[PDB]
Amino acid sequence: MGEWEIIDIGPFTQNLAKFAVDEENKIGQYGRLTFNKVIRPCMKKTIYENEGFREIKGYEYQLYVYASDKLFRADISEDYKTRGRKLLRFNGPVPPP
Secondary structure (H helix, E strand, O other), X not given: OOOOEEOOOOOOHHHHHHHHHHHHHHHOOOOOOOOOEEOOOOEEEEEOOXXXXXXXXXXXXXXXXXXXXXXXXXXXXXXXXXXXXXXXXEEEEXXXX
């Protein structure tokens, strides 16, 4: 759209949260913890062409799922072409505020 904006609640924020756990388990990349919680609320944005060689890669959803005892920074990027979900969860980690 232009800048950051609010994240959709209901079958969307939860869907993303589940996607994280599900897909992470399906691959086995780092190893998800155990249904802890999320800070809430969370926020979305549109990634720009940041040396990306393409005008608008898509949307991004930035969320801070609490796990173990850290706000693991967990993001997802979408594909502007359609509406894919590229696993960008489980990064940082981020310490608590």
